Amino acid sequence: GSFTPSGTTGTTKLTVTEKCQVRVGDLTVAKTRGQLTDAAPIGPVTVQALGCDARQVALKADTDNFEQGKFFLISDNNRDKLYVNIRPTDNSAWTTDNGVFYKNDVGSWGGIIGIYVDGQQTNTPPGNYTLTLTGGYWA
Amino acid sequence: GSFTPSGTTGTTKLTVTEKCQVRVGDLTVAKTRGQLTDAAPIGPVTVQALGCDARQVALKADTDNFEQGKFFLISDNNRDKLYVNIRPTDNSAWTTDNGVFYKNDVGSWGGIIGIYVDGQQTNTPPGNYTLTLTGGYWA
Amino acid sequence: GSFTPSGTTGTTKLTVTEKCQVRVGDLTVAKTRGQLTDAAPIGPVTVQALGCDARQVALKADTDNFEQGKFFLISDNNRDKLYVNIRPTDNSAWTTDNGVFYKNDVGSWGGIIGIYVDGQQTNTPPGNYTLTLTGGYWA
Ligand SMILES: O=C(N[C@H](CO)[C@H](O)c1ccc([N+](=O)[O-])cc1)C(Br)Br
Numbered sequence: 001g002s003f004t005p006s007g008t009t010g011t012t013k014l015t016v017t018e019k020c021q022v023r024v025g026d027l028t029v030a031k032t033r034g035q036l037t038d039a040a041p042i043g044p045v046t047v048q049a050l051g052c053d054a055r056q057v058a059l060k061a062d063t064d065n066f067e068q069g070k071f072f073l074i075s076d077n078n079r080d081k082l083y084v085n086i087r088p089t090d091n092s093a094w095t096t097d098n099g100v101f102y103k104n105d106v107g108s109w110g111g112i113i114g115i116y117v118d119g120q121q122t123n124t125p126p127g128n129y130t131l132t133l134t135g136g137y138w139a
Numbered sequence: 140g141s142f143t144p145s146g147t148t149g150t151t152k153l154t155v156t157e158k159c160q161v162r163v164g165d166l167t168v169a170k171t172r173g174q175l176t177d178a179a180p181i182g183p184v185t186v187q188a189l190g191c192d193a194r195q196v197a198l199k200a201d202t203d204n205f206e207q208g209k210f211f212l213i214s215d216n217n218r219d220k221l222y223v224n225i226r227p228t229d230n231s232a233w234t235t236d237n238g239v240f241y242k243n244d245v246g247s248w249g250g251i252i253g254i255y256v257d258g259q260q261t262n263t264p265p266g267n268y269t270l271t272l273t274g275g276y277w278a
Numbered sequence: 279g280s281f282t283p284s285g286t287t288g289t290t291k292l293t294v295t296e297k298c299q300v301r302v303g304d305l306t307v308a309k310t311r312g313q314l315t316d317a318a319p320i321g322p323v324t325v326q327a328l329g330c331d332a333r334q335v336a337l338k339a340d341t342d343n344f345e346q347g348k349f350f351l352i353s354d355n356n357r358d359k360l361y362v363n364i365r366p367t368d369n370s371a372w373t374t375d376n377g378v379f380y381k382n383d384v385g386s387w388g389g390i391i392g393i394y395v396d397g398q399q400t401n402t403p404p405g406n407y408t409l410t411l412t413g414g415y416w417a
Pocket residue numbers: 041042043044045089112113114115116
C-alpha cells in the first residue's frame with residue numbers, strides 16, 4: 001500500500017475541560033471530559049475530490065495521530081491521546097492501512113467524514129487536542 | 140493559590156508600527172507607537188463560564204506574558220514587552236496572583252475583560268505583540 | 279538601501295497537488311502542478327499605507343522567500359521553491375533590492391500587488407507553499 005499526498009489538509013480540534021469550563025475569546029469546539037462518551041461526535045470533515053476518476057481517494061493522518069491501526073487526537077504536548085473512529089456519513093466502503101484511511105473503489109468522491117469518540121474516555125486530561133488529515137490517493 | 144486549566148484560550152494581538160504604517164493583507168489590530176498612551180485600549184477579551192457555580196473563574200497568562208505581578212504583551216522574538224492592565228468592564232472584584240487573574244467570588248461569570256496600555260509606552264519597538272490567556276478556575 | 283519594518287504581514291499560501299486532487303476541510307487556494315503555467319495568477323495582496331507622505335512604501339519578503347534578486351513561495355519543509363513575479367496592478371513604478379520590493383516615489387500608496395508564477399513550473403512537487411511579505415518603508 002502506498003499513499004500519495006495530493007490535496008489539502010483538514011484539522012479537527014477539540015478542547016477538553018472539566019465541568020467548570022471557562023471559554024475565552026471566540027467560540028471553538030469544546031467539551032467537558034464527561035461528554036467524551038462512546039461514539040460521541042467530535043466534528044465532521046468535508047472531502048471533495050476532483051480528477052480522481054481512476055484513483056482511490058485517501059486521507060492520511062499526521063504521524064502523531066496514529067499508532068497500531070488506531071487513530072487519535074493528540075494533546076498539544078504530544079502526550080495524551082483521545083482515540084477516535086473515522087467513518088463516512090454515507091454507505092461507502094473504506095479501509096485503514098497504517099495511518100491511511102482510503103476508499104475501496106476509485107472515483108472522485110465528495111462526502112463527509114465523521115470523527116467520533118472511540119470508547120468512553122471521560123478521564124481524558126483537560127487540554128487542546130488535534131487530529132490532522134491530509135488528502136491524497138492510495139494504490 | 141492554585142490554578143486549574145479548564146477552558147479555552149483567547150489571544151490578544153497587536154502590531155506596533157511607526158507613523159508611516161504599511162498594512163499588508165487582511166485587517167488586524169495595529170497602532171503606531173505614538174498611540175500607546177497610558178490607558179489606551181488594546182482590545183476586549185470575552186469570557187463565558189459554565190458549570191462554575193462553586194468555583195472562582197480565572198484566566199492564566201502564558202509564562203512569557205507575566206513577571207513580578209505584572210502582565211505584558213510580548214514581541215514575536217520574546218524580547219520586547221508592552222505592559223498592560225487587565226480589568227473587567229463591569230464592577231466585579233478580581234485578584235492577581237503570579238500570572239493568574241481570578242474572580243473574588245465563586246460563580247459562572249460571563250463578561251468582558253479589557254486590555255489597556257499600562258503607562259505611556261510610546262517608545263515601544265515596532266513588531267508583533269501577543270498576550271495569551273487560558274480559562275480555568277482558582278482555589 | 280535600508281528597509282524599516284513598519285506595518286503588518288500578508289501571507290500568500292498555495293497548495294500544489296497532482297491531477298487527482300483531494301480537498302479536505304475549508305476551501306483554500308489550491309492548484310494542480312499542471313496549472314502552474316507562466317504568468318499564472320496565485321493571488322492578490324492588498325496594501326494600504328498611512329502616514330507615509332514622505333517615505334517610500336515597501337514590502338520585505340521573509341528570508342526564506344528570496345535569494346539572488348528572485349522571489350519565491352517556499353514549501354513547508356523549506357526545500358522546494360515556486361518562483362514568482364511581484365507586480366502592482368496599477369501603473370506605479372517599483373524596485374527590487376535584496377528581498378525588498380519598494381515604491382520609486384514617496385507617498386501613502388494604497389493598491390493591489392499581484393503574485394504570479396514566474397516561468398512554467400508544472401513539475402513543482404505537491405506540497406504547501408508560502409510567501410510572507412511585511413510592510414514598511416525604504417530609504
Ligand atoms: O458532527 C457530526 N454530527 C452532527 C451532530 O450530530 C451532524 O449530524 C452534522 C452532520 C453534517 C454536517 N455537515 O455536513 O456539515 C454537520 C453536522 C458528525 Br459527521 Br462527527
